[PDB]
Design an enzyme around this catalytic site. Sequence first.
Site, PDB file in Angstrom:
ATOM      1  CG  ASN A   1      -1.698   1.247   1.507  1.00 38.29           C
ATOM      2  OD1 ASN A   1      -1.288   2.046   2.369  1.00 38.29           O
ATOM      3  ND2 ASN A   1      -2.756   1.516   0.789  1.00 38.29           N
TER       4      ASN A   1
ATOM      5  CB  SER B   1      -4.312   5.087  -8.662  1.00 39.89           C
ATOM      6  OG  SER B   1      -3.312   4.865  -7.677  1.00 39.89           O
TER       7      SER B   1
ATOM      8  CE1 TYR C   1       0.110   7.438  -6.430  1.00 35.34           C
ATOM      9  CE2 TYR C   1      -1.388   7.820  -8.272  1.00 35.34           C
ATOM     10  CZ  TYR C   1      -1.156   7.341  -6.991  1.00 35.34           C
ATOM     11  OH  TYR C   1      -2.210   6.816  -6.283  1.00 35.34           O
TER      12      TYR C   1
HETATM   13  N1  NDP Z   1      -6.083   8.677  -1.409  1.00 35.53           N
HETATM   14  C1  NDP Z   1      -6.458   8.563  -2.677  1.00 35.53           C
HETATM   15  O1  NDP Z   1      -7.153   9.406  -3.252  1.00 35.53           O
HETATM   16  C2  NDP Z   1      -5.976   7.397  -3.502  1.00 35.53           C
HETATM   17  C3  NDP Z   1      -5.068   6.542  -2.993  1.00 35.53           C
HETATM   18  N2  NDP Z   1      -4.574   5.453  -3.759  1.00 35.53           N
HETATM   19  C4  NDP Z   1      -3.562   4.526  -3.241  1.00 35.53           C
HETATM   20  O2  NDP Z   1      -3.835   4.164  -1.900  1.00 35.53           O
HETATM   21  C5  NDP Z   1      -2.586   4.011  -1.184  1.00 35.53           C
HETATM   22  C6  NDP Z   1      -2.582   4.892   0.048  1.00 35.53           C
HETATM   23  O3  NDP Z   1      -2.945   6.247  -0.311  1.00 35.53           O
HETATM   24  P1  NDP Z   1      -3.164   7.267   0.907  1.00 35.53           P
HETATM   25  O4  NDP Z   1      -3.585   6.517   2.128  1.00 35.53           O
HETATM   26  O5  NDP Z   1      -4.007   8.383   0.359  1.00 35.53           O
HETATM   27  O6  NDP Z   1      -1.735   7.909   1.243  1.00 35.53           O
HETATM   28  P2  NDP Z   1      -1.040   8.308   2.624  1.00 35.53           P
HETATM   29  O7  NDP Z   1       0.025   9.331   2.269  1.00 35.53           O
HETATM   30  O8  NDP Z   1      -2.209   8.624   3.488  1.00 35.53           O
HETATM   31  O9  NDP Z   1      -0.207   7.106   3.228  1.00 35.53           O
HETATM   32  C7  NDP Z   1       0.913   6.522   2.529  1.00 35.53           C
HETATM   33  C8  NDP Z   1       1.639   5.674   3.539  1.00 35.53           C
HETATM   34  O10 NDP Z   1       2.951   5.295   3.051  1.00 35.53           O
HETATM   35  C9  NDP Z   1       3.927   5.644   4.015  1.00 35.53           C
HETATM   36  N3  NDP Z   1       5.186   5.955   3.339  1.00 35.53           N
HETATM   37  C10 NDP Z   1       5.502   7.115   2.679  1.00 35.53           C
HETATM   38  N4  NDP Z   1       6.726   7.149   2.214  1.00 35.53           N
HETATM   39  C11 NDP Z   1       7.261   5.929   2.603  1.00 35.53           C
HETATM   40  C12 NDP Z   1       8.547   5.371   2.468  1.00 35.53           C
HETATM   41  N5  NDP Z   1       9.569   5.998   1.877  1.00 35.53           N
HETATM   42  N6  NDP Z   1       8.760   4.142   2.996  1.00 35.53           N
HETATM   43  C13 NDP Z   1       7.744   3.521   3.607  1.00 35.53           C
HETATM   44  N7  NDP Z   1       6.492   3.948   3.789  1.00 35.53           N
HETATM   45  C14 NDP Z   1       6.316   5.174   3.277  1.00 35.53           C
HETATM   46  C15 NDP Z   1       3.315   6.812   4.784  1.00 35.53           C
HETATM   47  O11 NDP Z   1       3.796   6.862   6.138  1.00 35.53           O
HETATM   48  P3  NDP Z   1       5.101   7.527   6.762  1.00 35.53           P
HETATM   49  O12 NDP Z   1       5.104   8.954   6.194  1.00 35.53           O
HETATM   50  O13 NDP Z   1       4.973   7.416   8.264  1.00 35.53           O
HETATM   51  O14 NDP Z   1       6.198   6.697   6.170  1.00 35.53           O
HETATM   52  C16 NDP Z   1       1.864   6.356   4.890  1.00 35.53           C
HETATM   53  O15 NDP Z   1       1.657   5.459   5.982  1.00 35.53           O
HETATM   54  C17 NDP Z   1      -1.476   4.285  -2.199  1.00 35.53           C
HETATM   55  O16 NDP Z   1      -0.940   3.090  -2.768  1.00 35.53           O
HETATM   56  C18 NDP Z   1      -2.177   5.165  -3.223  1.00 35.53           C
HETATM   57  O17 NDP Z   1      -1.529   5.206  -4.481  1.00 35.53           O
HETATM   58  C19 NDP Z   1      -5.100   5.222  -5.045  1.00 35.53           C
HETATM   59  C20 NDP Z   1      -5.987   6.035  -5.580  1.00 35.53           C
HETATM   60  C21 NDP Z   1      -6.465   7.267  -4.915  1.00 35.53           C
HETATM   61  O1  SFF Z   2      -7.557   8.384  -8.326  1.00 37.63           O
HETATM   62  S1  SFF Z   2      -6.210   8.797  -8.829  1.00 37.63           S
HETATM   63  O2  SFF Z   2      -5.851   8.260 -10.180  1.00 37.63           O
HETATM   64  N1  SFF Z   2      -5.059   8.530  -7.747  1.00 37.63           N
HETATM   65  C1  SFF Z   2      -4.722   9.499  -6.797  1.00 37.63           C
HETATM   66  N2  SFF Z   2      -3.743   9.191  -5.954  1.00 37.63           N
HETATM   67  C2  SFF Z   2      -3.240  10.162  -4.965  1.00 37.63           C
HETATM   68  C3  SFF Z   2      -2.172  11.070  -5.659  1.00 37.63           C
HETATM   69  C4  SFF Z   2      -1.434  12.005  -4.658  1.00 37.63           C
HETATM   70  C5  SFF Z   2      -0.844  11.204  -3.482  1.00 37.63           C
HETATM   71  C6  SFF Z   2      -1.936  10.367  -2.759  1.00 37.63           C
HETATM   72  C7  SFF Z   2      -2.644   9.403  -3.754  1.00 37.63           C
HETATM   73  O3  SFF Z   2      -5.284  10.758  -6.789  1.00 37.63           O
HETATM   74  C8  SFF Z   2      -6.390  11.138  -7.538  1.00 37.63           C
HETATM   75  C9  SFF Z   2      -6.470  12.689  -7.533  1.00 37.63           C
HETATM   76  C10 SFF Z   2      -5.219  13.307  -8.176  1.00 37.63           C
HETATM   77  C11 SFF Z   2      -4.963  12.755  -9.607  1.00 37.63           C
HETATM   78  C12 SFF Z   2      -5.076  11.219  -9.728  1.00 37.63           C
HETATM   79  C13 SFF Z   2      -6.335  10.624  -9.009  1.00 37.63           C
END
Ligand code: NDP
Ligand code: SFF
Lengths: 263, 266, 264, 263
Positions: A99, A150, A163
């Site tokens: 994740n 995503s 990304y």
């Molecule tokens: N939120 C959204 O709109 C969407 C999210 N996603 C996917 O869902 C997942 C989570 O997104 P979201 O919860 O929003 O993001 P967050 O930024 O909320 O969390 C990301 C996590 O990764 C950890 N992290 C960051 N850098 C590192 C590193 N170098 N090594 C290890 N761990 C790391 C962060 O913690 P710490 O800083 O403590 O390391 C945190 O726990 C991702 O894979 C994302 O692409 C997909 C589509 C849309």
């Molecule tokens: O649903 S997504 O394709 N994934 C994401 N992922 C996030 C992108 C920024 C870091 C946290 C996850 O974001 C949505 C809004 C910005 C553009 C892309 C769309």
Amino acid sequence: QPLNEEFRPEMLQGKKVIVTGASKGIGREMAYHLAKMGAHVVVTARSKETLQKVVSHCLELGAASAHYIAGTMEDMTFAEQFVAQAGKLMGGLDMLILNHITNTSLNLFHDDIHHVRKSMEVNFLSYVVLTVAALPMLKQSNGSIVVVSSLAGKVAYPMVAAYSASKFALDGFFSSIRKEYSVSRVNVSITLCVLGLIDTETAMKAVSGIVHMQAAPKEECALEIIKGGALRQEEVYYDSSLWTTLLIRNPSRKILEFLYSTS
Amino acid sequence: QQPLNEEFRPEMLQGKKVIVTGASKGIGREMAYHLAKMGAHVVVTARSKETLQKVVSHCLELGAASAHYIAGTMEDMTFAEQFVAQAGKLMGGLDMLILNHITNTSLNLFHDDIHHVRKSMEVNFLSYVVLTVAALPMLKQSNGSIVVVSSLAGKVAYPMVAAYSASKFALDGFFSSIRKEYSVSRVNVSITLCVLGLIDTETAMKAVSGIVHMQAAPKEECALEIIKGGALRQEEVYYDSSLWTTLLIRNPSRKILEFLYSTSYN
Amino acid sequence: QQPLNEEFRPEMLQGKKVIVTGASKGIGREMAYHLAKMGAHVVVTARSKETLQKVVSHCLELGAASAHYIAGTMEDMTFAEQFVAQAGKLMGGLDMLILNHITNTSLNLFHDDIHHVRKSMEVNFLSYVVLTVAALPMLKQSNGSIVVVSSLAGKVAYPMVAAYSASKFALDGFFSSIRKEYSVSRVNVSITLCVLGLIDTETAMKAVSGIVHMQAAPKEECALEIIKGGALRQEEVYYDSSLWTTLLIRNPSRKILEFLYSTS
Amino acid sequence: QPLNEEFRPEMLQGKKVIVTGASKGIGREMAYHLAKMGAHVVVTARSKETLQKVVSHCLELGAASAHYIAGTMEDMTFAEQFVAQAGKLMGGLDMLILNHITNTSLNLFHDDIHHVRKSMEVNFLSYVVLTVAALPMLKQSNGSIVVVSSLAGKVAYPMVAAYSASKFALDGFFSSIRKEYSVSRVNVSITLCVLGLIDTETAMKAVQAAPKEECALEIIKGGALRQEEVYYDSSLWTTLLIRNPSRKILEFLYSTSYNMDRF
Ligand SMILES: NC(=O)C1=CN([C@@H]2O[C@H](COP(=O)(O)OP(=O)(O)OC[C@H]3O[C@@H](n4cnc5c(N)ncnc54)[C@H](OP(=O)(O)O)[C@@H]3O)[C@@H](O)[C@H]2O)C=CC1
Ligand SMILES: O=S1(=O)N=C(NC2CCCCC2)O[C@H]2CCCC[C@H]21
Ligand SMILES: NC(=O)C1=CN([C@@H]2O[C@H](COP(=O)(O)OP(=O)(O)OC[C@H]3O[C@@H](n4cnc5c(N)ncnc54)[C@H](OP(=O)(O)O)[C@@H]3O)[C@@H](O)[C@H]2O)C=CC1
Ligand SMILES: NC(=O)C1=CN([C@@H]2O[C@H](COP(=O)(O)OP(=O)(O)OC[C@H]3O[C@@H](n4cnc5c(N)ncnc54)[C@H](OP(=O)(O)O)[C@@H]3O)[C@@H](O)[C@H]2O)C=CC1
Ligand SMILES: NC(=O)C1=CN([C@@H]2O[C@H](COP(=O)(O)OP(=O)(O)OC[C@H]3O[C@@H](n4cnc5c(N)ncnc54)[C@H](OP(=O)(O)O)[C@@H]3O)[C@@H](O)[C@H]2O)C=CC1
Ligand SMILES: O=S1(=O)N=C(NC2CCCCC2)O[C@H]2CCCC[C@H]21
Ligand SMILES: O=S1(=O)N=C(NC2CCCCC2)O[C@H]2CCCC[C@H]21
Ligand SMILES: O=S1(=O)N=C(NC2CCCCC2)O[C@H]2CCCC[C@H]21
């Protein structure tokens, strides 16, 4: 082959699960849902104090066990070592939830090779290192790999090019080894989760003023990821738009994969 | 981007300044020969110094406005960056960047080969990003074109080529997202992604030996279709022995979704 | 409609009361044979009593709970209406209505043959509507199913079969619109549209001779695939040698447009 | 094979055009646009009184000539004789605009087979009879057939089942003969117009409604330019989703498996 059953929270009772990127957002919501289901959980991220708080809340919610190991997924030695330690704490591994992502904002790409390579190393390569290190335990348990992706991992998306490249690479890699595991009789499932905008603090801040749509709830999202993995489904789609679910599907890709397999 | 609403003609490449990577053999070499016959200026690269000299001599014989080679490995990001600067000086600018090289790949089950995954990502993907960044000022000056060579394994899952597939999928996500950025930011540099099926190059034919396979398409026509797509500034080129694969793998649903999501941002 | 969220099993048809039209030969005959083997009650129809008799004989032997025939032309809307009422009486109800007959058609360019255009619309389309009206009360009582046999020429333009194409496209427009109506009126009767490619029936093999060079899919599995679609209450189903035909059914852009417009 | 030129109103100057269903709504609006362009027009519908006012206004607008022939398209003898009469009067025919429908209201299908049959006879079968009658004159002028259809002619719509059946029939029929004409070298174009909700008195009473005058001009434009399909709706999202590129690709691919030389 997915489980042709409806999801039951009991499917996760006593299961040994790793959740990466679990200090905040969706990853944290997953650890909590798993704890309530009575799973054994090993959480990871860089922030040790927030991971401490997560583990303590997991125990309150009813986790069979909860531990954290802090480290950066930029460090490939840590990624490999983390899986061995997590496995030793739980006495095995049933589910690997991949994740974590490197910090990213919406910006036009211009000369930022550093962020392209960082996105590839953290969002993609570490997932492969973690998979290699986990597979022996997953083969022993007929386990599951859950890959968080995503809309930008299925279609082009401006402002998130590095990304998007990392998320597309996860699909190519994990979907290709899924076909290899099918023909080699490796009974480890691979679930690719395609998410739209989720109301996490990170995403809400990153999109503020630039991208405006909603924003599905993070709690329900985390549960959908767990359900899809538990049910050994190939792909999970979680978005607020009904157009997405219908158009995101690619039967043409599925036809080609079947036709090129008989060769 | 908006493609050129016209038929291709070989005169479109006359006097154009073109880089062809991975041009010592296979499709890349065929592309260099086509461009030479069209009267383009060509700068070819790959690791093989001696075969590059032979390709360059044949290019001059075919009618190239000029032809030069620079040998080196695309595993080296410094070489990739320096190569563009030098190719640019040799031709006095740049009109088209044809990104075609790949690292050596065979058909094998993935087990624990992180080294091959990382090398495929570095050579097949990251170096194309580094080359694009280095070439961008010259392409913006000429209203130029980037041509990215990819595969059916860059659009759909293929077993036994997981690392290769991951790198070709990455090209799609990167190049297609920056294409969308260029359209709104009014950067008049076209991006063409080429999706090829099995082609009769010595590398691919040796790689698929020991396996049942469909008809390999001819490398010479393949190389021509890549140039045509780039010259016409098309978004995607599909080229496979099967007309059914060529026409039906193209994804209009994805294009619809990209349009829908675009309305939700500024 | 809501399809059956389960795998098909031949026991689903045991004791079911099924009508099969155009069942003296080709796909319709094969469907009757499959239903016979499944222990269903079957009523078969077509114009030829001699061939229908042979079908019924084989059905009784195969293990049908009951098997009967009623001969008549679907050009006659009075026969169509009366056939269903008589078929319902023979079985004591109706669970599935399989609409499969078509008027005799050959491959030819269209010139001034309005008679064939009209006959195609009446036989291949209008009679299906008359049969549906006649069956609906019984189907409503049993939470039944309507199965409509169609073609590639019913989803795309097809030269040499224009009158036929028009009738198959009409089936899609009519039956797909009433399926939306059954969702709003809460009518628990499923509608399945079957999109078939070239099938090795005596009629199609003779008609395509020297014109079309393509793989003809087998009628036996075709027939079972139609029955399965209906048994699983699926909206659309396909059967063809080419996997690419899947693109002709469950069209996502069409589903979105339908959702959009209904809610307005 | 559409004309790769921009539309110009002079394309209709002195052209001999039939417009059916032209006493009101879209048909009347087409008659008026053709009149402003200086075309020769023959209009038809059942009502002589309304047709008389349309003809008078066409002459005032600048029509080269304007006449009406009243009758019901329920009568196939009238349909065939109407084309012969209209063509003999104008001294030929360049464009046949097929626009009439039987009176239809929004209602659930309620065993009204008579309505299904009348809709098929009037909205579909009469269009075929009109085409057969017009074909010799259209072949002489390398003319055009314009078929007016609907969203209910491409997708399922509750409350218009009989209407939907007839519009879907027009697509199957006219699109299959266009393919036959292409190979038989019949230089008569066929334009299928897929219209969304239009602000006609009939539609406004029966039911974001697109304007009838612009709708009518778009139909004429597509016909004049020999386009295969014209899409006209108030929503740009409808125009985006109505296209079916997979259908056009499959029609081409199926053509590679048959040989029409015998005909
Ligand atoms: N939120 C959204 O709109 C969407 C999210 N996603 C996917 O869902 C997942 C989570 O997104 P979201 O919860 O929003 O993001 P967050 O930024 O909320 O969390 C990301 C996590 O990764 C950890 N992290 C960051 N850098 C590192 C590193 N170098 N090594 C290890 N761990 C790391 C962060 O913690 P710490 O800083 O403590 O390391 C945190 O726990 C991702 O894979 C994302 O692409 C997909 C589509 C849309
Ligand atoms: O649903 S997504 O394709 N994934 C994401 N992922 C996030 C992108 C920024 C870091 C946290 C996850 O974001 C949505 C809004 C910005 C553009 C892309 C769309
Ligand atoms: N052939 C096929 O079936 C298909 C090919 N493709 C794509 O077409 C392109 C060319 O394929 P093809 O011609 O078959 O392959 P070849 O192996 O014939 O050519 C690859 C080229 O890259 C060069 N190269 C290899 N390693 C490096 C390196 N580290 N640094 C720089 N250059 C390097 C090689 O030359 P040198 O050894 O001298 O360095 C050669 O000129 C690739 O992008 C491939 O993915 C896509 C689908 C199918
Ligand atoms: N075979 C193929 O390649 C394909 C078939 N299909 C569809 O599958 C279905 C069956 O095709 P297939 O089995 O090949 O056809 P057949 O020609 O084998 O059988 C048609 C049936 O309809 C009956 N029938 C014909 N005219 C009438 C009439 N006026 N009244 C009542 N019944 C009549 C025939 O019997 P009798 O003459 O005794 O009345 C016969 O039982 C049709 O809906 C067809 O459109 C779709 C695509 C391809
Ligand atoms: N308006 C809309 O929202 C939409 C319209 N369309 C299509 O556009 C076309 C025109 O629609 P619109 O202008 O709203 O309809 P109108 O009801 O306004 O006009 C219909 C015309 O047909 C004539 N007509 C009716 N019955 C017959 C008959 N038996 N014989 C001959 N002519 C007949 C009417 O005149 P009279 O009664 O005097 O004969 C009138 O001239 C149709 O093909 C319709 O399907 C498509 C999508 C939406
Ligand atoms: O068309 S492809 O997706 N690309 C390729 N690319 C080649 C992979 C081997 C080295 C040269 C390029 O190969 C085809 C045959 C092996 C499996 C994948 C298919
Ligand atoms: O799959 S179809 O569209 N339907 C059919 N239906 C048959 C048409 C002739 C009579 C039997 C049914 O035939 C195929 C071969 C001829 C052209 C059309 C295709
Ligand atoms: O755009 S349409 O598909 N066609 C029509 N056609 C009309 C239907 C009634 C009579 C005039 C034409 O109306 C729209 C509103 C009612 C439901 C269907 C849609």
